[PDB]
Design a protein around this ligand. Structure first.
Ligand SMILES: [Zn+2]
Ligand SMILES: [Zn+2]
Lengths: 20, 141
């Protein structure tokens, strides 16, 4: 579980960075 | 015969195959994907290495697991461009690994699997977001 979830979370963090 | 699929495959395949040894939107999207994706790999190398270690890819059977990860992420109803670029970036990171273990022949199929799942699960979201033109705009400058 941790692996999938860590990737998803990174993607969301990158999304927030560029949506800024 | 599905232009969005064809375009997505061209962009994603070119990026992943670049780790081994046509329209305006596709060219710009490839440049954007490489620019952002290579940055993600550089800044997240330790994390990506740990994920790759968990996948423990040493043979053809292990490459199956990777297609299952892609399906798993894109099946999530949550969608955004950050997720899309990050998953493709991890795909390119694994493609580098595949090259180093002499499994270059897995790279094009990996790109096809990523493209298949992305378009099958997110087609409507992608079009609503203006497709690859929207991708270029989101990550612009
Ligand atoms: Zn190149
Ligand atoms: Zn293979």
């Amino acid at each position: 579980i941790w692996l999938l979830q860590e990737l998803l979370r990174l993607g969301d963090e990158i999304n927030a960075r560029y949506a800024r | 015969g599905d232009e969005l699929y064809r375009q997505s495959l061209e962009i994603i395949s070119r990026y992943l195959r670049e780790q081994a040894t046509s329209g305006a939107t596709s060219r710009k999207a490839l440049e954007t994907l490489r620019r952002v994706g290579d940055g993600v790999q550089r800044n997240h190398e330790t994390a990506f290495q740990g994920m790759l270690r968990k996948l423990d890819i040493k043979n053809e059977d292990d490459v199956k697991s990777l297609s299952r990860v892609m399906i798993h992420v894109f099946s999530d109803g949550v969608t955004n461009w950050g997720r899309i670029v990050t998953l493709i970036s991890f795909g390119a990171f694994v493609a580098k690994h595949l090259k180093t273990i002499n499994q270059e022949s897995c790279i094009e199929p990996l790109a096809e699997s990523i493209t298949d799942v992305l378009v099958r699960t997110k087609r409507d979201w992608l079009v609503k977001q203006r497709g690859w033109d929207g991708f270029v705009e989101f990550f612009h400058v």
